[PDB]
C-alpha cells in the first residue's frame, strides 16, 4: 500500500543517512591506501537498521534492514563507490583499488534489488554491486530503483 | 539513571554517525577552498536527531538531539575540525580557513557542554567550539567528555 510504502521509505532513508559513517570510513581508508573497512565501527543497531558493513576489497556498503522494513532475505540495500579513471576530463568510472592512495571525490551509487545496471551521469556507468541487494526498489529512494 | 544514560549514549552514537555526512562535506570544501557548508544539507530529522548544521566559516558541526536523548537546551554536541600549521613540520593545530586549499588530514574533536578544554595529542590543543555545546558529557561517548 502507499501508506506502507511511506513507512518503509522513511526508514530506508534513515538507514542510508546512518551509512554516511561508512562512506566516510571508506573515504579515509581510500586516502591512506588501507582496506576499505579498516577501523570502521558501525553505529548501534536501531529498530530499523540491523547492520551496516563495508566490503574491505571494493568499499561497497551493505545496509540490512529489520523486519519492520522488509522481510529477511529481501532487506539489503547496497551503495557502490567509484572514482573517475582520471580526474581531468574522465572517460569512465572505475571501482576503487585496495591499497592505492586515492584522495579524490568518491561517487556512491545506490542499488536496490531490482536495479540491473548502473545509471550515472558522465563519465558514465559505475560498477555493479559485489553482493546483490535484495530490498525491493519500491521501498527505497528513487535513485536506488530500476 | 545508568540504563537511561546508556540508552542516550547509544542514540548519540546514531547522531555522530549521521554527522559523518557533514564531516565529509567539510573535508570536500576544505580541499576546494569553498565555504565549509557548501552543498551540504542536514540529513532527515529522526526520532533522536533534530538537526546537524555546519558553520560555513570554521567547519564546526552542531548536532542537536531530540528530547528522547536530552532536554531542549541541554541537547547539543559540537565537532571541531583542525589541521596542523604544517603537515610535514608541525608546531600547533589551527582552525580551518575558508578559501585556503587544504588537502591534508583534518582532525575532529568532539565537545560536550562540560568539556572544559581541547584535549588532543601532539601537536597540541585544537580550537574550542565557537558557541557552547550543551549536552552533558555523561550522555556522550567518552571522546566528547571532560
Ligand atoms: Br534508524
Ligand atoms: Br564492516
Ligand atoms: Br569522498
Ligand atoms: Br535497470
Ligand atoms: Br565528465
Ligand atoms: Br522516498
Ligand atoms: Br537517528
Ligand atoms: Br555522505
Ligand atoms: Br548547514
Ligand atoms: Br538532559
Ligand atoms: Br600533525
Ligand atoms: Br546533567
Ligand atoms: Br558510548
CB half-sphere exposure, B69, CA atoms < 13 A: 30
Output phi, psi for B110, to 5 deg: -95, 135
Distances (CA, A) of B101 to A12, B31, B34, B37: 36, 5, 8, 15
Query: A23: helix, coil or strand?
Result: helix
Looking at residue A81, which CATH number applies to its domain?
A: 3.30.700.10
Strand partners, B80: B109
Identify whether the C-beta of residue A65 lies closer than 8 Å to the C-beta of residue A136: no
Residue from B21, B40, B110 whose CB has the most chain A CBs within 10 Å, to mutate? B21
Is the Cβ of A20 closer than 8 Å to some Cβ of chain B?
Answer: yes
Separation in Å, CA of A32 to nearest CA in chain B = 10
Distances (CA, A) of A42 to A53, A56, A62, B44: 7, 14, 11, 19
Identify whether the C-beta of residue B82 lies closer than 8 Å to the C-beta of residue B45: no
Chain B residues within 8 A of A18 when measuring between CB atoms = 14, 17-18
Domain assignment present for B78: yes
Domain assignment present for A40: yes
CA distance B131 to B120: 19
Q: Which domain holds residue A122?
A: 2-136
The structure was resolved experimentally with X-ray
**Chain-chain contact of B13 with A105 (C-beta, under 8 angstroms):** no
Domain assignment present for B145: no
Distances (CA, A) of A71 to A50, A67, B7, B21, B23: 12, 5, 26, 28, 33
Strand partners, B81: B108
Domain count, chain A: 1
Domain assignment present for B81: yes
Domain assignment present for A143: no
CA distance B17 to A30: 19
Domain assignment present for A61: yes
Which residues contact residue A69 at a Cβ distance below 8 angstroms, ignoring those fewer than 6 apart?
A8, A11, A12, A15, A48, A75, A135, A139
Report the run of H or E that residue B108 belongs to, with start and end.
Answer: strand B107-111
Which residues contact residue B72 at a Cβ distance below 8 angstroms, ignoring those fewer than 6 apart?
none
Domain assignment present for B97: yes
**Chain-chain contact of B44 with A10 (C-beta, under 8 angstroms):** yes
CA distance B26 to B44: 18
Is the Cβ of A73 closer than 8 Å to some Cβ of chain B?
Answer: no
Which residues contact residue A106 at a Cβ distance below 8 angstroms, ignoring those fewer than 6 apart?
A23, A26, A27, A30, A59, A81, A82, A83, A96
Closest-CA residue to A137 (of A95, A80, A78) = A78
Block residue for cell numbers 597540541: B124
Return the DSSP state at A14.
H
CA distance B38 to A43: 26
Distances (CA, A) of A62 to A80, B14, B46: 9, 17, 21
List strand residue ranges (DSSP E) for A89-140, in order: 93-95, 107-111
Query: B94: helix, coil or strand?
Result: strand
Residues, Cβ < 5 Å to ion ligand 6: A 9, 141
Return the DSSP state at A62.
E
Q: Chain B: residue nearest A104 by CA?
A: B28
Domain assignment present for A50: yes
Amino acid at each position: 500500500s502507499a501508506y506502507q510504502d511511506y513507512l518503509a521509505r522513511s526508514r530506508v532513508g534513515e538507514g542510508l543517512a546512518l551509512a554516511a559513517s561508512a562512506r566516510l570510513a571508506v573515504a579515509e581508508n581510500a586516502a591512506s591506501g588501507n582496506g576499505f573497512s579498516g577501523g570502521y565501527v558501525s553505529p548501534p543497531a536501531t529498530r530499523n537498521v540491523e547492520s551496516i558493513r563495508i566490503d574491505d576489497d571494493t568499499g561497497q556498503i551493505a545496509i540490512a534492514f529489520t523486519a519492520r522494513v522488509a522481510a529477511a532475505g529481501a532487506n539489503t540495500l547496497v551503495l557502490v563507490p567509484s572514482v573517475p579513471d582520471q580526474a581531468d576530463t574522465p572517460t569512465a568510472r572505475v571501482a576503487l583499488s585496495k591499497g592505492v592512495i586515492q584522495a579524490g571525490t568518491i561517487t556512491w551509487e545506490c542499488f536496490a534489488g531490482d536495479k540491473a545496471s548502473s545509471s550515472l551521469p558522465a563519465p558514465g556507468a559505475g560498477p555493479m554491486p559485489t553482493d546483490a541487494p535484495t530490498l525491493a526498489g519500491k521501498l527505497a529512494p528513487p535513485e536506488c530503483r530500476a
